Design a protein around this nucleic acid. Structure first.
Ligand SMILES: Nc1ncnc2c1ncn2[C@H]1C[C@H](O)[C@@H](COP(=O)(O)OP(=O)(O)OP(=O)(O)O)O1
Ligand SMILES: [Mg+2]
Ligand SMILES: [Mg+2]
Lengths: 395, 539
DNA sequence: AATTCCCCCCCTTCGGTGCTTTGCACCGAAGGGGGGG
């Protein structure tokens, strides 16, 4: 193991935690130090990463999650056997890509001795009664991007004992979660996977067919007002960037009169032709939206109200790779947190890498509550946007 | 004596040598005090004499402890600090008495000579060499080096805190019914087991500490209330801060105002209603720290109200885990908020204020959400649970804001309280054009190279008005155009503009702004009953 | 003259960043102060 050339280790501070989280986290680490996975260290180790408890849905138990985002970016590119061995076409297609927990497999392989300094974290105290208790990992940690790749040799060897007797099923691994897709009925797809859990006991459901959306259809009206035509040219000039060739020349020459916003102006033959034709250009995706692996993914999110959201995954501005919507009205951070989780899961199944979120939320609001409704194991890298968007161009 | 705890290994930054700084000329009384301290330090093995084998040096000096008649020996390890390896500090905050539970018996202890009881790494001892100057000024000088943790070294606070935690670990593990708050060497110990059995358990702690090198003298060991702990005055049933004294001077300088603001911020934690907004703005253009600054009769007003609040005696109460945390918020105007956290009515656990102004444009609802966020994270630190809020905003007002704002906003379980100064949105932009009202097609643009431009409207009725203006940018021209439209309008108006900079400001619904131009727009948007704003591409 | 070190807080200031409509809004780090040891 080695760090990225000309870099350093994580130096992120630890945010305050709830009493229930702290009480559970201490008990987890008390039983973790008795096994040798973590060991107490001192202040001479200058590195630190945050930590929190992430109790999952239908679990009734707490799980330790460590924010390793900063370590992952500074860790020299870690190869599964070359990078990540699967690029599953058919995981994005089949019926039932199930996500199951690897979880405790990593807590068998010890980490390289010289690299253990970077995986340091501090457990806070309520009303700062004692200084924070520092630990470092001895075994492979959960959340590090190099952790799955070390276990790959011990992971690719438990595939053949099952994947060879179930060939067409494509199993994909990202961090501590295993994605496996099968085009079987719920009666079958559940029974076979149940044995996979039993085949992973002693050996120590997303549907990517309803994925497309990508619509920008214009509203249909018989009586068109000057304001309504104003709302179309504005919508069809930005759309001329996403879809080059959108024609509103004659849809603006009827707006050259400076009358009121409530006047009912009829459309000419050219305007009706241009409006009708421009729908066809909106029925075909832009030609040449290439996906290259050497760039990074960006996923915007926009709030549309009534518990409805919208997102756009793209590598280049105005060159969208997947645009979709999310549906449900009493908790806003809870809805946004769940939306982020669904987008990340979609991005893993399709392109294999987590995107860069541009959250439509105030920065300080996020950390105060995102750890409460979070239920995943990985953490996407996100940034915040302090700018109100235009009128609804995706609703 | 010196504790037998294992030393923490420490290194220098790669490619860096030890310091070679020279001693300053010290005064007579500080040299005499230093020689006295260094003599007894050498007798106990805390420092060792050296000679010509050590090329390093670092200035030393002394200050006076709180309890005087005693000197604190400090070393200006400023060059060594730049070359020492980086540490990670384990002190994440300060304990608060509001988070203390009610204990029948309480005892406070202080470790004597805290740093000088922890050994220093043997390989690092050479860099800590110093030189007590010649008694008077004629002899060569005695060169020493530190065998214990030096005072003034960047690694000492972290090393001692970790060492103290390891020393206390065996005692706390075998005595889990006793609460022990540790802040450096300060030890607050309280529990049940009435004073007859509490003292017996305390002597066991002192014996445990003494076996581990640290000594707790009887002079610093408090046994009866009130207990002076971390700047507070803990009593059996209540807690108050130690007395706060504000300057009574008549000629205020920049430093004096800064000192006064800091003390009032410190006092604004159990004392309710403290405001420092008018005092703080006096420092918004100052340069030197010793220039006399007049009081603007508004800072005099605040300093009079703050002096009245601090005159009466106030106290807090202790946390009760079997009850509910409640936090009320009040708006004080001019972007000032106060809050009090309590479990029973009229018995505050803690008080505070929020006055930060984030962004160039904001309103009351955005600020109140920011105030709630600050209280929430502060409550998690002290009590580990978020409190139940009692906000001065109607549920309908909050419901309309969060279902129309483009961002995601939330407030935890809260209840409306009818405190007169209520939080309310002042205007509201309509979602559809107004039928029966004029429409303004208003926008102007300036020049990027000459710094002047024009801004006016054209109406559907044929009327228009233009006004040239200079020393304004392109964005500033657009705002003056929208303001001008609201000027030459009626009670209902439809406004159409061709740029989005003004839209983002106006749709955010501000009621105050750090820019003058947006401010009169707010005064105009409130007078109208219906206003609709539409954006069109610049063509 | 002062000469130190870690932690939390608040308030003000300046440079970097992003989108750019190359001005303007956000944000973090550094100065002052308070408190603790
Ligand atoms: N001004 C300071 N500069 C550096 N370190 C300090 C300073 N004040 C306190 N400390 C650190 C070093 C001290 O050993 C430790 C404990 O504080 P304190 O009890 O006041 O000192 P002490 O334990 O050396 O003296 P005492 O024997 O009187 O208790 O805090
Ligand atoms: Mg003391
Ligand atoms: Mg002491």
């Amino acid at each position: 193991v080695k760090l990225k050339p000309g870099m350093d280790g994580p130096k992120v501070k630890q945010w305050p935690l709830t009493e229930e989280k702290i009480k559970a986290l201490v008990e987890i680490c008390t039983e973790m130090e008795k096994e040798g996975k973590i060991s107490k260290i001192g202040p001479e180790n200058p590195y630190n990463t945050p930590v929190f408890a992430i109790k999952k849905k239908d679990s009734t138990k707490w799980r330790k999650l460590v924010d390793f985002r900063e370590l992952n970016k500074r860790t020299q590119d870690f190869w599964e056997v070359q990078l990540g061995i699967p690029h599953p076409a058919g995981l994005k297609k089949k019926k039932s890509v199930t996500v199951l927990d690897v979880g405790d497999a990593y807590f068998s392989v010890p980490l390289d001795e010289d690299f253990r300094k970077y995986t340091a974290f501090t457990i806070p105290s309520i009303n700062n009664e004692t200084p924070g208790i520092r630990y470092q990992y001895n075994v492979l940690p959960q959340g590090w991007k190099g952790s799955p790749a070390i276990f790959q040799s011990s992971m690719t060897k438990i595939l053949e004992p099952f994947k060879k007797q179930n060939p067409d099923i494509v199993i994909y691994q990202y961090m501590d979660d295993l994605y496996v897709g099968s085009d079987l009925e719920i009666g079958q797809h559940r029974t076979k996977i149940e044995e996979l859990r039993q085949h992973l006991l002693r050996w120590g459901e997303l549907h990517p067919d309803k994925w497309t959306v990508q619509p920008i259809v214009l509203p249909e009206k018989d009586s068109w007002t000057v304001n309504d035509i104003q709302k179309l040219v504005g919508k069809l000039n930005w759309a001329s960037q996403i879809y080059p060739g959108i024609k509103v020349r004659q849809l603006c020459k009827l707006l050259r009169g400076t009358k009121a916003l409530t006047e009912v102006i009829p459309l000419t033959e050219e305007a009706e032709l241009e409006l009708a034709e421009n729908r066809e250009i909106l029925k075909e995706p832009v030609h040449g939206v290439y996906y290259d692996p050497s760039k990074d993914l960006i996923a915007e999110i926009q709030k549309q109200g009534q518990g409805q959201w919208t997102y756009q995954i793209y590598q280049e501005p105005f060159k969208n790779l997947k645009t979709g919507k999310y549906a449900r009205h009493t908790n806003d951070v809870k809805q946004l947190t769940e939306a982020v989780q669904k987008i990340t899961t979609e991005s893993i199944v399709i392109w294999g890498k987590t995107p860069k979120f541009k959250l439509p939320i105030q920065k300080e609001t996020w950390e105060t509550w995102w750890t409460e409704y979070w239920q995943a194991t990985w953490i996407p890298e996100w940034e915040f946007v302090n700018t109100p968007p235009l009128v609804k161009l995706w609703y | 004596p010196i504790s037998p705890i294992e030393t923490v290994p420490v290194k220098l930054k790669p490619g860096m040598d030890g310091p070679k700084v020279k001693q300053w000329p010290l005064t007579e009384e500080k040299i005499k005090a230093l020689v006295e301290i260094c003599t007894e330090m050498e007798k106990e093995g805390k420092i060792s004499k050296i000679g010509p084998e050590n090329p390093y040096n670092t200035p030393v000096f002394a200050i006076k402890k709180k309890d005087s008649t005693k000197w604190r020996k400090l070393v200006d390890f400023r060059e060594l600090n730049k070359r020492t390896q980086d540490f990670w500090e384990v002190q994440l905050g300060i304990p608060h008495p509001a988070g203390l539970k009610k204990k029948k018996s309480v005892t406070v202890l202080d470790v004597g000579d805290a740093y000088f009881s922890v050994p220093l790494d043997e390989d690092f001892r050479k860099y800590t060499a110093f030189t007590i100057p010649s008694i008077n000024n004629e002899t060569p000088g005695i060169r020493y080096q530190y065998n214990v943790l030096p005072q003034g070294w960047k690694g000492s606070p972290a090393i001692f805190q970790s060492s103290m935690t390891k020393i206390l670990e065996p005692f706390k593990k075998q005595n889990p019914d006793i609460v022990i708050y540790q802040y450096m060497d300060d030890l607050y110990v309280g529990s049940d087991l009435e004073i007859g059995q509490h003292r017996t358990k305390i002597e066991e702690l002192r014996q445990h500490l003494l076996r581990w090198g640290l000594t707790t003298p009887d002079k610093k060991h408090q046994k009866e209330p009130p207990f002076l702990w971390m700047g507070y005055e803990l009593h059996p049933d209540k807690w108050t801060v130690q007395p706060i004294v504000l300057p009574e001077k008549d000629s205020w300088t920049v430093n004096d105002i800064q000192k006064l603001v800091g003390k009032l911020n410190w006092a604004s934690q159990i004392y309710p209603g403290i405001k420092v907004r008018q005092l703080s703005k006096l420092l918004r253009g100052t340069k030197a720290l010793t220039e006399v600054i007049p009081l603007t009769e508004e800072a005099e007003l605040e300093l009079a109200e703050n002096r009245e609040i601090l005159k009466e005696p106030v106290h807090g109460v202790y946390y009760d885990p079997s009850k509910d945390l409640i936090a009320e918020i009040q708006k004080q105007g001019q972007g000032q908020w106060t809050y009090q956290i309590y479990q029973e009515p009229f018995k505050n656990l803690k008080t505070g204020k929020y006055a930060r102004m984030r962004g160039a444009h904001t309103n009351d609802v955005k600020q109140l959400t920011e105030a709630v966020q600050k209280i929430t994270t502060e409550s998690i630190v002290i009590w580990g649970k978020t409190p139940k809020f009692k906000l001065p905003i109607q549920k309908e007002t909050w419901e309309t804001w969060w279902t129309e704002y483009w961002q995601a906003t939330w407030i935890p379980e809260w209840e409306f309280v009818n405190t007169p100064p209520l939080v309310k949105l002042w205007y509201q932009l309509e979602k559809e054009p107004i039928v029966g009202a004029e429409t303004f097609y208003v926008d102007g643009a300036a020049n990027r190279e000459t710094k002047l431009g024009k801004a006016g409207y054209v109406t559907n009725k044929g009327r228009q008005k233009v006004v040239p203006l200079t020393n304004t940018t392109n964005q500033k021209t657009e705002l003056q155009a929208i303001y001008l439209a609201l000027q030459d309008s009626g009670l209902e108006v439809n406004i159409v503009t061709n740029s989005q900079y003004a839209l983002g400001i106006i749709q955010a619904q501000p009621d105050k702004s750090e820019s003058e131009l947006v401010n009169q727009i707010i005064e105009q948007l409130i007078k109208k009953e219906k206003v609709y704003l539409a954006w069109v591409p610049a063509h």
